[PDB]
Design a protein around this ligand. Structure first.
Ligand SMILES: [Mn+2]
Length: 187
């Protein structure tokens, strides 16, 4: 029914406590959204990319908190474009447990503008729309409190941005967006 992936920014700018707050938020959202026909998957990215759980592994152990708890920060830069390409191509791959015909959803959480990435969003976004992946993005912190940086949030997110883009001042404020995300996803 619904294949919901998460692409979480694990860059060096996110101090340890904010990283745990992001893990608390993902656990909470996954728990609130869990239904028999919903599988979840997660990838963390910096300048490195790590699949923490595939849809298959989540199906065999549908416990968000036990799957998320052990996750450790990758540190490094922010290769957001490459992160979404690997999500589209690997996370939503049938061999990883994705269900053909399922609604494909991706929730991106980042605290900074893409930097150092060899790929541009122009190399990644069109393929994502072609594969049907609906995208939500949550921009956290200072990196996104200007009009210019918000455009990047819009570029990542599905149309219209007003329905798929969330900005929150700090990782502590993520909890302020929990209900809206869930209800946007459910709708
Ligand atoms: Mn960062």
């Amino acid at each position: 029914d619904s294949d919901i992936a998460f692409l979480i920014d694990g860059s060096g700018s996110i101090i340890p406590h904010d990283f745990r707050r992001m893990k608390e938020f993902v656990s909470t959202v996954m728990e609130q959204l869990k239904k028999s026909k919903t599988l979840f998957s997660l990838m963390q990215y910096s300048e490195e990319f790590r699949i923490h759980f595939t849809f298959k592994e989540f199906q065999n152990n549908p416990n968000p908190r036990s799957l998320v708890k052990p996750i450790t920060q990758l540190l490094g830069r922010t290769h957001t474009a490459t992160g979404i390409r690997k999500v589209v191509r690997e996370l939503f791959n049938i061999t990883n447990g994705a269900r053909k015909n399922a609604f494909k959803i991706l929730v991106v959480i980042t605290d900074g503008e893409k930097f150092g990435d060899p790929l541009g969003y122009e190399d990644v976004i069109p393929e994502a729309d072609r594969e049907g992946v609906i995208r939500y993005v949550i921009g956290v912190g200072d990196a996104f409190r200007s009009e210019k940086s918000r455009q990047e949030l819009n570029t990542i997110a599905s149309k219209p941005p007003r329905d798929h883009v969330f900005q929150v001042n700090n990782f502590e404020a993520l909890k302020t967006i929990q209900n809206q995300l869930r209800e946007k996803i459910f709708a």
